[PDB]
Design a protein around this ligand. Structure first.
Ligand SMILES: O=c1nc(-c2cccnc2)sc2ccccc12
Ligand SMILES: O=c1nc(-c2cccnc2)sc2ccccc12
Ligand SMILES: O=c1nc(-c2cccnc2)sc2ccccc12
Ligand SMILES: O=c1nc(-c2cccnc2)sc2ccccc12
Lengths: 114, 114, 114
């Protein structure tokens, strides 16, 4: 899986350990091995959410499966929780787009997962 | 809705108020209230379009609905117009990818939409 | 087509000709003229892959067609090869998401390709 967070919160506000925590928490949440989890945090972005430049985040989670109604609610609680606690971003200023990737459309190490 | 523009134009060339204008104009164009609209502008990027490093932009618009043939033509006219007028990017050096998101695949405020 | 690479490799380690090399190689691989190809490289990113911050890349390739099981297996070899040689990234620390875009969902030059 791959999780990306884009935020206007400054780099200095991203705690040491955050990438590791996202990796571990996402491994738990998706049930996929941590070695397959990629995480990408992009601070200091020029962003607005609802016209306001208060802290916000635009995120994506891509996974081959493990994406769906109840699962995505669980991920959103988890991930908004982490963004609120670690980056001090209000959950109502976060969007997370979820993508259920076909294995044939995910490349890795000179092939795909199909 | 979420609009992202990645461009090689420098940050200093992005006019004051650009994210506000994008918010307002996208609210009008999509019919969604501006509170729902998130905008993300990423200048100074290392990019090429057609092998040329002249000003260009790669953009995305994600929305739960309000995506379709005629609508996307209208968004393209609007958005290319703004990138041309405000960032001085030729419309023929802009790609905009449109994504119709299922509500269940959009997280917000500790949960997802439906 | 549009190819994006996000990587923790530093900017100074991205060769000046990489965007052009990618443009040319992707034109050959997709069978699309290079004028249609846009490339975006984002270095210096805060990323981890499998919980490690050794060099890695998260990439996407969007195209109106020319996307599919066999083609994506081929693109992965092409792109892993380029990332390994030019950016010194191990191919097992590369993900590439492939997106077959509907022409109606790709904006360009004030309109879409529909
Ligand atoms: O569910 C998975 N999703 C992966 C993914 C999806 C989209 C983008 N990038 C990566 S990689 C992976 C490797 C092994 C086992 C499961 C997975
Ligand atoms: O106007 C509203 N905006 C909302 C929203 C959703 C996502 C991002 N930003 C804002 S959710 C909402 C709930 C109840 C009543 C009004 C609203
Ligand atoms: O049209 C909407 N799209 C939203 C969206 C889509 C994709 C990514 N991020 C946000 S937020 C929203 C909230 C309530 C009612 C409509 C919408
Ligand atoms: O295959 C193509 N894909 C293009 C694309 C797709 C997704 C995102 N950005 C660009 S642009 C294009 C122009 C003319 C003829 C073919 C194409």
């Amino acid at each position: 899986p791959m999780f990306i967070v884009n935020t206007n919160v400054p780099r200095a506000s991203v705690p040491d350990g955050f990438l590791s925590e996202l990796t571990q928490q996402l491994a738990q949440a998706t049930g996929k091995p941590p070695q397959y989890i990629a995480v990408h945090v992009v601070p200091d972005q020029l962003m607005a959410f609802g016209g306001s430049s208060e802290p916000c985040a635009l995120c994506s989670l891509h996974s081959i499966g493990k994406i769906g109604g109840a699962q995505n609610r669980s991920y959103s609680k988890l991930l908004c929780g982490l963004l609120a606690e670690r980056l001090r971003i209000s959950p109502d200023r976060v969007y997370i787009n979820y993508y259920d990737m076909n294995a044939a459309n995910v490349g890795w190490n000179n092939s795909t997962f199909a």
